[PDB]
From a paper:
To further analyze the RBD-PD interface in detail, we also determined the structures of monomeric RBDs (BA.2.75, BF.7, and XBB.1) bound to the ACE2-SIT1 complex. These structures provided improved resolution of the RBD-PD interface, avoiding the flexibility of RBD, and were resolved at local resolutions of 2.9, 3.2, and 3.6 Å, respectively. Similarly, BF.7 carries mutations F371L, S408R, L452R, F486V, and R493Q compared to BA. Despite the presence of these numerous mutations in the subvariants, our structural analysis reveals a strikingly convergent binding pattern between the RBDs and ACE2. Of particular note is the single difference among BA.2.75, BF.7, and XBB.1: the substitution of Phe486 in BA.2.75 with Val in BF.7 and Ser in XBB. Additionally, the salt bridge formed by Arg493 of BA.2 with Glu35 of ACE2 is replaced by Gln493 in BA.2.75, BF.7, and XBB.1, reminiscent of the wild-type configuration. Overall, these mutations remodel the interaction network into a highly convergent mode, despite the presence of diverse mutations within the different subvariants. The monomeric human ACE2-PD exhibited binding to the RBDs of BA.2, BA.5, BA.2.75, BF.7, and XBB.1 with binding affinity (KD) of 4.80 ± 0.01, 3.2 ± 0.03, 1.2 ± 0.01, 4.1 ± 0.02, and 16.2 ± 0.03 nM, respectively. These values displayed heterogeneity compared to the WT RBD (12.5 ± 0.04 nM). However, despite these mutations, we have identified a convergent binding pattern between RBD and ACE2 in the BA.2.75, BF.7, and XBB.1 subvariants, suggesting ACE2 mimic monoclonal antibodies might have the most broad-spectrum neutralizing potency.
Residue numbers in the entry:
A (entry chain D): 19 to 615
B (entry chain A): 336 to 359, 364 to 517, 523 to 525
The structure:
């Protein structure tokens, strides 16, 4: 009759009804995503609204049990995940205003239009054309026009909305005892009451700042190399001791440097390994790819596919008229129903995306025995790390030469090694400073340390000091440059893309030692080893039942995220870069600007 | 013995109220079908033709796939404590098979109604069909739903696009007592 025993009684009924309603909602959403019609939209909206209403009613019902008298840890976790008010703690007018400005920001970002100065009836949206000009063009003036106009004709509409969204979200977050909206975001990595694995919401800042303090020696050399290579495609525009103009980086924002590969390739006469001709040579189809992926997965000690995965999944694009949004994803409809939705062609990118998606499917199959509220990764940075280590270890030459896609001998040299390592560095290391800087800016904005008359100044000061890029045109306090990013205007967190990159290589080095690898880390293959599978399964099957600082120790041996595995992975490229910059100047000065002349 | 009825009825009962038919040629059941599970406990499965008893009973129901392992002497769970409890001195022999193609309709089959709340654990070979409201807290609810008072039936949501372990599995539990031979 105590206050603890009634919690379990409530949780049982909640679990059952929630499983049922969630399955109905997910089935409706899938039937819409694979077959676009008009009545499917309403048939999906009905189930979605029913599920949301049930969730809201159970949430407002669960407030009767005080989280202080609970003794079990699983019950306490489930209650605390259910008791959270979230939004709707505000008034009604404020909630309507918040939803309106959120939808307005999303719409402004989605359908923003810019057009030419000399032919004003030639307007281009963002996705079909702006991030294509910024991706393939090699003209300085055209890239500058695109980068300036996107921020001058769309970013200027998002500032008076962001200035209100900040205050509204800060109020909503202070209504739940969080001191700001940034602490509400960092509250995901919190762990309390375990006696040995505690983790405050304020230690994430220090951990991030201490793990970024050791990537600077490598990012500096990569920056110097990319600068010395860019001083040849746009002569007399880059200075040998200055930063890089922000429009010569590869895309609209500079998040990924991966489009600079055609300019900064180390050895341009050795083609990187790309087995696409052999697949069409042996006539591989959309099903042999997934058979090979499943074979690789079962090789390490993980179960087969559930046999309900083959008939219900959509592995090929439906032909006649079945307009379908096929963005490769893995579904978890529940009750033992797993499906995959993707438009597979016969290439190598699909051959790796199959492994990436089946990684998510295996993770979902792992923890399917936990209660309903505990079916997720340990935190927001485990799912993608697990899904990425598979595609990391499945694209090696040693693995490709055993399936049959490569010639039997195929001696490997060090030039292609450096080519591959550098192509990997432009995507892995080229985004960590950007992510860290953006999330630091957002934390300082929400916390209240950057008054609303010093937003752009501080943004560009930090972009000059941390990332190492400079703007080509002065931006006063009417612009809002971060708001022109998808994750900033659509209200998504951004610290997961930083911790995922560390967890990925931590897991890879932890598994390389159970498989007893010998050479460098970027030649690892975990296949044909039942120790790596066992170590990984000791963590996959936990879900959110345990604190993440314990699920991490059960694999790597430490509690906090580390940065040594990443440097151990990039060691050879590091030495080569350190010997290619004997004459250049490693570093930058924050005074040179492309307009100060 | 008319085994053609207890194995082939067009509609099987539910777990909380299982149909018990008494009997006043086992080579027809042993040699017939896939039979996903077939375990005989007191008597060896092969010599079922030389030892006979006073009467046999054939209970039946429809439970979920991953709960078949609970129909056994000395088990615990939402099925073996509240709906159907087999004594530790069992002598009969359990059988169960998959029936996904018959007892599952697209859109949900809400006629199978396992019970999940009860004041005490069931005794061996008892049946409880009462439908009173379970009182969780300390304040009586006088037979109405609300807070800390729930409806003790939680009908299965059967569908064809489920996974093995969530599909319907018919069950028959022959139990002997010592005639028919
Ligand atoms: C895609 O959805 C449309 C409509 O939502 C389906 O079109 C009809 O659906 C009804 C539903 O019972 C069927 O009776 C009709 O036969 C369907 N028309 C045709 C021309 O097939 C359509 O079948 C769906 N596609 C798939 C592959 O399920
Ligand atoms: C309350 O806590 C106990 C132990 O602190 C949990 O007992 C576990 O229960 C699961 C399944 O019910 C078993 O697999 C474990 O072996 C049990 N552990 C121990 C140490 O006995 C119990 O599950 C908790 N309550 C709930 C609702 O989860
Ligand atoms: C969640 O929101 C409710 C309001 O909707 C907060 O207020 C408490 O609600 C309970 C439930 O009826 C009342 O019994 C209390 O008197 C309310 N005031 C309190 C507790 O000061 C509730 O505090 C919120 N809880 C959380 C964890 O956000
Ligand atoms: C790849 O390896 C070869 C040898 O295995 C390297 O060639 C030697 O490089 C050193 C260092 O510059 C020279 O002192 C030797 O004279 C070279 N030997 C020959 C036969 O050329 C080559 O430099 C390596 N390439 C990279 C990119 O590391
Ligand atoms: C995993 O191990 C198996 C067996 O040890 C390998 O399968 C054999 O590989 C050799 C190497 O060419 C072939 O000659 C045999 O014909 C293979 N046997 C079978 C039954 O296929 C497999 O290649 C290994 N996989 C990896 C990635 O190392
Ligand atoms: C269960 O009943 C069905 C139908 O009553 C039986 O199906 C019959 O199968 C025989 C062949 O063995 C056919 O000649 C009949 O036409 C079928 N009847 C119908 C209506 O389908 C089935 O044999 C029975 N199974 C058992 C185990 O007795
Ligand atoms: C997986 O399925 C294949 C058949 O395609 C079978 O040969 C193999 O034994 C199965 N492995 C496991 C672990 O179930």
């Amino acid at each position: 009759s105590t206050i603890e025993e009634q919690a379990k009684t409530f949780l049982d009924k909640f679990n059952h009804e929630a499983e049922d309603l969630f399955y109905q909602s997910s089935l409706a959403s899938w039937n819409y995503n694979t077959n676009i019609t008009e009545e499917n939209v309403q048939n999906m909206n009905n189930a979605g609204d029913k599920w949301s209403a049930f969730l809201k009613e159970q949430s407002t019902l669960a407030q009767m049990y005080p989280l202080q008298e609970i003794q079990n840890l699983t019950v306490k976790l489930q209650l605390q995940a259910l008791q959270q008010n979230g939004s709707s703690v505000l008034s009604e007018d404020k909630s309507k205003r918040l939803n309106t400005i959120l939808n307005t920001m999303s719409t402004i970002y989605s359908t923003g239009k810019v057009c030419n100065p000399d032919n004003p009836q030639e307007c281009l949206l963002l996705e079909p054309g702006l991030n294509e000009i910024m991706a393939n063009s090699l003209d300085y003036n055209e890239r500058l026009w695109a980068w300036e106009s996107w921020r001058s004709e769309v970013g200027k509409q998002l500032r008076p909305l962001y200035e209100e969204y900040v205050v509204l979200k800060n109020e909503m977050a202070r209504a739940n005892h969080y001191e700001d909206y940034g602490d509400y975001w960092r509250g995901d990595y919190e762990v309390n009451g375990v006696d040995g694995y505690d983790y405050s919401r304020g230690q994430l800042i220090e951990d991030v700042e201490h793990t970024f303090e050791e990537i600077k020696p490598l990012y500096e050399h990569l920056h110097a190399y990319v600068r010395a290579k860019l001083m040849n495609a746009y002569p007399s525009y880059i200075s040998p001791i200055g930063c890089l103009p922000a429009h010569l980086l590869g895309d609209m924002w500079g998040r990924f440097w991966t489009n600079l590969y055609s300019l900064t390739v180390p050895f341009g006469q050795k083609p990187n390994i790309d087995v696409t001709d052999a697949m069409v040579d042996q006539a591989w189809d959309a099903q042999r790819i997934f058979k090979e992926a499943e074979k690789f997965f079962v090789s390490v000690g993980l179960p087969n596919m559930t046999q309900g995965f083959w008939e219900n999944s959509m592995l090929t694009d439906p032909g006649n008229v079945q307009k379908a949004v096929c963005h490769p994803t893995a579904w978890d409809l529940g009750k033992g129903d797993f499906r995959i939705l993707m438009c597979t062609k016969v290439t190598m990118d699909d051959f790796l995306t199959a492994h990436h998606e089946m990684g998510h499917i295996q993770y979902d199959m792992a923890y399917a025995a936990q209660p309903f509220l505990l079916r997720n990764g340990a935190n927001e940075g485990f799912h993608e790390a697990v899904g990425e280590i598979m595609s990391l270890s499945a694209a090696t030459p040693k693995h490709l030469k055993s399936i049959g896609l490569l010639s039997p001998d195929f001696q490997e040299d060090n030039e292609t090694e450096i080519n591959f390592l550098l192509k990997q560095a432009l995507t892995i290391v080229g985004t960590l400073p950007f992510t860290y800087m953006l999330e630091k800016w957002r934390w300082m904005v929400f916390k209240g340390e950057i008054p609303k008359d010093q937003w752009m100044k501080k943004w560009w000061e930090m972009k000059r000091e941390i990332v190492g890029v400079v703007e080509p045109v002065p931006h006063d306090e009417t612009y809002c440059d971060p708001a022109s990013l998808f994750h900033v205007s659509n209200d998504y967190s951004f610290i997961r893309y930083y911790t995922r990159t560390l967890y990925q290589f931590q897991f890879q080095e932890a598994l390389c030692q159970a498989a007893k690898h010998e050479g460098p880390l970027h030649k690892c293959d975990i296949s044909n080893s039942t120790e790596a599978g066992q170590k990984l399964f000791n963590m996959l099957r936990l879900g959110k039942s345990e604190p993440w600082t314990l699920a991490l120790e059960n694999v790597v041996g430490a509690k906090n995220m580390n940065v040594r595995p990443l440097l151990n992975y990039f060691e050879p490229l590091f030495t080569w870069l350190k010997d290619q910059n004997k004459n250049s100047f490693v570093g930058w000065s924050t005074d040179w600007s492309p307009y100060a002349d | 013995c008319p085994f053609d009825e207890v194995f082939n009825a067009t509609t099987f009962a539910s777990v909380y109220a299982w149909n018990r038919k008494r009997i006043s040629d086992y080579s027809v059941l042993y040699n017939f079908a896939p039979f996903f599970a077939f375990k005989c406990y007191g008597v060896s499965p092969t010599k079922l033709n030389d030892l006979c008893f006073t009467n046999v009973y054939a209970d039946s129901f429809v439970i979920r796939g991953n709960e078949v392992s609970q129909i056994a002497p000395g088990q615990t769970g939402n099925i073996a404590d509240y709906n159907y409890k087999l004594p530790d001195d069992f002598t009969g022999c359990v059988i169960a098979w998959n029936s996904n193609k018959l007892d599952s309709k697209v859109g949900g089959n809400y006629n199978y109604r396992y019970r999940l709340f009860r004041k005490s654990n069931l005794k061996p070979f008892e049946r409880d069909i009462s439908t009173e409201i379970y009182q969780a807290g300390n304040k009586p609810c006088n037979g109405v739903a609300g807070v800390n008072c729930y409806f003790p039936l939680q009908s299965y949501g059967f569908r064809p696009t489920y996974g093995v372990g969530h599909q319907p599995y018919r069950v028959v539990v022959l139990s002997f007592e010592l005639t028919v031979c």
